[PDB]
Design a protein around this nucleic acid. Structure first.
Ligand code: MG
Ligand code: MG
Ligand code: MG
Ligand code: MG
Ligand code: MG
Ligand code: MG
Ligand code: MG
Ligand code: MG
Ligand code: MG
Ligand code: MG
Ligand code: MG
Ligand code: MG
Ligand code: MG
Ligand code: MG
Ligand code: MG
Ligand code: MG
Ligand code: MG
Ligand code: MG
Ligand code: MG
Ligand code: MG
Ligand code: MG
Ligand code: MG
Ligand code: MG
Ligand code: MG
Ligand code: MG
Ligand code: MG
Ligand code: MG
Ligand code: MG
Ligand code: MG
Ligand code: MG
Ligand code: MG
Ligand code: MG
Ligand code: MG
Ligand code: MG
Ligand code: MG
Ligand code: MG
Ligand code: MG
Ligand code: MG
Ligand code: MG
Lengths: 54, 122, 119, 211, 117
RNA sequence: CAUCUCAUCCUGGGGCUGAAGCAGGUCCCAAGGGUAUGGCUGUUCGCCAUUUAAAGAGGUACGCGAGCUGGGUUUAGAACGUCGUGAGACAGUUCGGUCCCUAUCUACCGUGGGCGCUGGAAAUUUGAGAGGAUCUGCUCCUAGUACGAGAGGACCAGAGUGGACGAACCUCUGGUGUACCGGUUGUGACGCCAGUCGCAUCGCCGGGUAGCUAUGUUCGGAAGGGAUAACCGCUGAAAGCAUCUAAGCGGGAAGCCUACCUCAAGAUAAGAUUUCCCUAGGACUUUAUGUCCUCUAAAGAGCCGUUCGAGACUAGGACGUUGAUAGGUUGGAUGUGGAAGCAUAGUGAUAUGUGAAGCUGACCAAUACUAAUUGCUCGUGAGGCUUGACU
RNA sequence: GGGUAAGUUCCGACCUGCACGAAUGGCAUAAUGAUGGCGGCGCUGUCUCCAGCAGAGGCUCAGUGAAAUCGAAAUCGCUG
RNA sequence: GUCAGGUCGAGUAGACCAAGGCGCUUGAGAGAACUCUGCUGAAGGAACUAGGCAAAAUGGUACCGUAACUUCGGGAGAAGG
RNA sequence: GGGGAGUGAAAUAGAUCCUGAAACCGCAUGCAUACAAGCAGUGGGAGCACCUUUGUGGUGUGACUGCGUACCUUUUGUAUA
């Protein structure tokens, strides 16, 4: 139910050794020149040579 | 699929009407009996003046079940009730009249009298 | 286990799920471009393309089927006058699902759903 | 024991002249191509390496491309070895082909496949554990494990204890199955009974080890 | 069918090519080969068709009769050589595909209205 | 839910017998596997009924309540017998009476990340080692023979068919199948008739495709090799004989090691085989697998996307336009069982024809219609030294 | 003695009442009781022996964010 | 404490609606073991258990029919159709 | 919320504003650390890094190795579970 001894600050940092974040897949849409998330519509509505909500 | 506490009809005319299974014979921890399997029964209902009386403990052979009987081609045969036939201590049938149909699984040499006296053998 | 099974649950009862997908189909047929979540968008194809396939033949039984399945008279009128004749010579694939980032208050993956030859 | 690699195509029945129905599994064999022969002098043991199927050349690496081009054969979808002897390594050469005619009707075989995966499963399914009372005061303990040990002697759980975990998805061999039909024009084997895995998975057929 | 074309090609090689058409609700007589070792004969099973299954080679149909006061159901496999011959005697007029309710009726209450053309 | 011992209940191997045979008694060797369900009582036990090859004896906090229960005992209520003047009490009996904890560390069952493995990569592997499994009945046959006055009734050897346990699988037989088809009650709506939606446990009722399943279907525990236990020897002295032992040579068990299935090189001793990739320039001094600046970025792996009979998250399998990976579309199959509209017959409920119609999740086959992109990151530039063999 | 194949409980008797007994009442008694014991019919996932499905959690992602405990920890097995 | 409509109904019970009022101040996915709340289940039918605990079952209106025993009221909606 | 500018002797005296300790929590540099079993020190002792001198000097780290079961209380007697 509960610990008998407190955890050292070393064993607490050893558990967090898998807690790191990674980056996303970002590409340059040289149809428009901007940076965008791969396979996603850009911030203003562009994708692979088409524009939504002109 | 007969097991302990199952009630069965009597298909012969030895004097019993309802019998109850109290032991499936032939093996340690054996669960079910099907057509052709010996069974230990107690007599719950009998006819006034016959050789078997209410409360006796006898051997019997199961001849009809609701669960069914598989055949080599993949077919089943079901019946509308469960029935048995009373036997001796020698394991020989003891009646002179069978009632109802019967399957071919009883074409052994110790059960050929039921086949002979049966109205219909499937 | 889930071997070879189709359909979603999406945290709802069966009847709520049916009602929500019917509502989505009606909204799509009206506006022709909507924004939803990606798991809701990918299951909407399986609900909304059969209605367009059905509206390609304009009979009374077909229109009564479309009304039993949409319960919206404006949608039935738009399917058998506009949307059906537009895709009469297209063999399936009348929608388009496009990933569109994440929701602010939720961090939920979103998508655009649009009709193919709109505007 | 030299055998065949095939694909499980489905399960069927065959009626015989005497009316008996025989449950059968169909195995499709695209004829196997010999890609390598390992011998005592360069390997330490005798084996025949075999490929079957087809792969598109954009999914074959340059190393596997060179290995397949060293023989004559085309790239298949998998590669597998069979331990053999000589008098079994008799006429086998690279660029050879093993077909369904390696077997005959009435032969006994073993078929190894990869069984279906059931995921993370409990004690009742994985080890045929018995359940506890359903309604006689039982609180929240129906399909749970029960006891896992003793009391301070030995003071630990023993190794190999039966618990919950992953079930299925292993290599399983079924021995003692009979060949029912060897169709040469469709390149198919039909065997009697059930074989491990799903439809479409890779199976290996080889003569029985018991005999 | 819903099977791979290879299993279907293997199954087609052993279909009975001329079976009489019948539906659930009809009464049929089936002739079944029985063989007690050396001897071979045919036994008749006459009764009402209760169910039917359409799966090519995996077809089957269930027949129900009353023999000596006890009800019997057999589930014949259609394309099995044990079934020598089927003949339809009387056609019935029913409104569903499975007549399992007839299991809990007997006598005048289990009668089937004959289909007349 | 177990785990161990052997002082062994069954099965296996033997010596003696007041051992004719079958069956027993007793002792020795043997721990591989196996080793009932019920009636009564809170019972452990015990008695009884019916089975079985058999229903072993014990240790493990009289194994096991941070795994469950709470019938007995041993709080508070109440009563009987008995004891006490009484408050109360018991070699007693009787009816009723709250079972808390989200798991930190060790252990255990699964599943990943890192680095190592003498340049890097993609596969295919060897097996030091580990785990699993290991049970048994009845019939036939030899043969109604050997043995026995008879009644009875074999060893050795072979053939079949069961029980219990386990695995895999879904063709068959069934269950389930709240995104499939139909019948029907109440009420509200869609303007109304007709039609058909919401809600009432999926309202209720009858069916049922895939998948998953057991009660369904197949298969397994076969045969062999080696060293042994008790026991039986051959030859043979010490001890002219005798003697299985001292020298020498043998037979011998469900036990041991192999043999069958599965895992396995983090086996840090980190093994092997096939194939693939990398061959530019300048300075420079802490002078050595030394550093710095331009040039370069391979084989491959991953991110991402479409997804899966793979899955908690992972990992693993397939595909990404030179494409059938998923959805849709078209054909088929299946289930349900005679759609809507119209026409006819009938006073009407309704029935018939058009027409086995209409609809039909997850199935099979085709088909680029929709989505799998223009990409980015990582991974380098020939791989120290010393010896010995071949050149 | 009865009931069950089998009944330490139940019902009927016997009287050998360890230690019943007549208003701290004795022996019965129709009706009534969420009262104690025992036996039947029906019905059943209580069970043999569990399978499938539905919703809420569990699990993953985003936001907020406790608890009891705690000498310090570089916190393995067996035999003593 | 007061008011309290419609269809069916004996009803202020109950299902669905009116007028009126709300979707209850974390969501999105996935669809493992196990836990909770449900639904269906072959053949058997209390073998479960201290104990049929829990579930399953019965259920309306009219008419026919109803035992011992009794304090003469009952029992009795006995039972059963 | 901060960065410049400006005030002031002083702004890590800027309003949570004199001084500003410890427990606790970061970022940077050096060395050690992924085949090895336990009160974490102590006695030895190689290597590396930085200062310095021409060191038998200084500072940090510590491969490998002998020995080694916390403190208080109460007790005949405590690593004591
Ligand atoms: Mg730190
Ligand atoms: Mg799928
Ligand atoms: Mg949710
Ligand atoms: Mg509903
Ligand atoms: Mg899976
Ligand atoms: Mg509780
Ligand atoms: Mg519960
Ligand atoms: Mg210990
Ligand atoms: Mg011994
Ligand atoms: Mg007992
Ligand atoms: Mg009883
Ligand atoms: Mg104990
Ligand atoms: Mg108690
Ligand atoms: Mg008291
Ligand atoms: Mg099936
Ligand atoms: Mg099914
Ligand atoms: Mg109407
Ligand atoms: Mg409502
Ligand atoms: Mg289609
Ligand atoms: Mg309809
Ligand atoms: Mg009892
Ligand atoms: Mg008294
Ligand atoms: Mg008195
Ligand atoms: Mg009262
Ligand atoms: Mg969170
Ligand atoms: Mg049932
Ligand atoms: Mg049933
Ligand atoms: Mg009982
Ligand atoms: Mg019991
Ligand atoms: Mg109850
Ligand atoms: Mg209920
Ligand atoms: Mg300062
Ligand atoms: Mg200050
Ligand atoms: Mg090291
Ligand atoms: Mg340690
Ligand atoms: Mg003390
Ligand atoms: Mg003391
Ligand atoms: Mg000491
Ligand atoms: Mg301790």
């Amino acid at each position: 139910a509960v610990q008998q001894n407190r955890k050292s600050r070393s064993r607490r940092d050893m558990r967090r050794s898998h807690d790191a974040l990674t980056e996303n897949a970002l590409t340059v849409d040289q149809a428009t020149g901007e940076t965008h998330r791969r396979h996603h519509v850009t911030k203003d509505g562009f994708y692979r040579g088409r524009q939504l909500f002109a | 699929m007969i097991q302990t506490e199952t009630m069965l009809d009597v298909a012969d005319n030895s004097g019993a009407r309802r019998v109850q299974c109290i032991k499936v014979l032939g093996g340690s921890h054996r669960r079910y009996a099907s057509v052709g399997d010996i069974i230990k029964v107690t007599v719950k209902e009998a006819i006034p003046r016959a050789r078997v009386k209410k409360g006796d403990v006898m051997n019997a052979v199961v001849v009809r079940t609701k669960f069914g009987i598989r055949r080599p081609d993949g077919s089943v045969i079901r019946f509308d009730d469960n029935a048995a036939v009373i036997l001796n201590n020698n394991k020989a049938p003891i009646a002179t009249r069978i009632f109802g149909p019967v399957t071919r699984e009883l074409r052994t040499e110790q059960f050929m009298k039921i086949i002979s006296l049966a109205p219909e053998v499937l | 286990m889930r071997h070879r099974n189709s359909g979603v649950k999406l945290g709802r009862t069966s009847s709520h799920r049916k009602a929500m997908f019917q509502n989505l189909a009606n909204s799509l047929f009206e506006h022709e471009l909507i924004k939803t979540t990606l798991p809701k968008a990918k299951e909407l194809r399986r609900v909304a393309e059969p209605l367009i396939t059905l509206a390609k033949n304009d009979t009374v039984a077909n229109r009564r089927l479309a009304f039993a399945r949409t319960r919206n008279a404006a949608t039935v009128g738009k399917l058998f006058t506009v949307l059906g004749p537009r895709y009469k010579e297209r063999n399936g694939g009348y929608l388009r699902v496009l990933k569109a980032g994440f929701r602010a208050g939720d961090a939920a993956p979103m998508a655009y759903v649009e009709l193919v030859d709109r505007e | 024991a030299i055998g065949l690699v095939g694909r499980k195509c489905g399960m069927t029945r065959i009626f015989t002249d005497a009316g008996v129905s025989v449950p059968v599994t169909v195995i499709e064999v695209d004829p196997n191509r010999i890609t390598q022969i390992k011998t005592l002098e360069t390997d330490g043991y005798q084996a025949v390496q075999v490929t079957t199927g087809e792969r598109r050349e954009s999914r074959v690496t340059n190393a596997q491309k060179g290995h397949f081009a060293k023989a004559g054969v085309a790239a298949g979808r998998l590669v597998k070895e069979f331990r053999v002897t000589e008098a079994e390594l008799e006429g086998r050469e690279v660029g050879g082909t093993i077909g369904v005619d390696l077997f005959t009707v009435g032969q006994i075989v073993d078929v190894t496949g990869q069984s279906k995966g059931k995921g993370f499963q409990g004690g009742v399914k994985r080890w045929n554990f018995r359940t506890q009372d359903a309604t006689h005061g039982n609180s929240v303990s129906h399909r749970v494990l029960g006891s896992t040990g003793q009391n301070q002697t030995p003071g630990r759980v023993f190794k190999g204890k039966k618990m919950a975990g992953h079930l299925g998805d292993e290599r399983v061999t079924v021995q003692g199955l009979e060949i029912v039909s060897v169709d040469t024009e469709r390149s198919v084997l039909v065997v009697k009974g059930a074989i491990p895995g799903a439809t479409g998975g890779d199976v290996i057929v080889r003569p029985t080890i018991k005999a | 069918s819903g099977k791979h074309p290879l299993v279907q090609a293997i199954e087609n090689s052993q279909l009975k090519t001329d079976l009489p058409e019948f539906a659930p609700g009809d009464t049929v007589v089936v002739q079944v080969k029985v063989k007690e070792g050396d001897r071979e004969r045919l036994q008749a099973f006459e009764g009402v068709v209760i169910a039917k299954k359409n799966r090519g080679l995996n077809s089957a149909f269930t027949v129900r009769k009353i023999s000596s006061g006890v009800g019997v159901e057999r589930v014949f496999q259609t394309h099995s050589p044990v079934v020598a011959k089927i003949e339809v005697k009387r056609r019935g007029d029913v409104r569903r595909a499975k007549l399992y309710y007839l299991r809990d009726l007997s006598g005048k209450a289990a009668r089937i209205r004959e289909k007349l053309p």
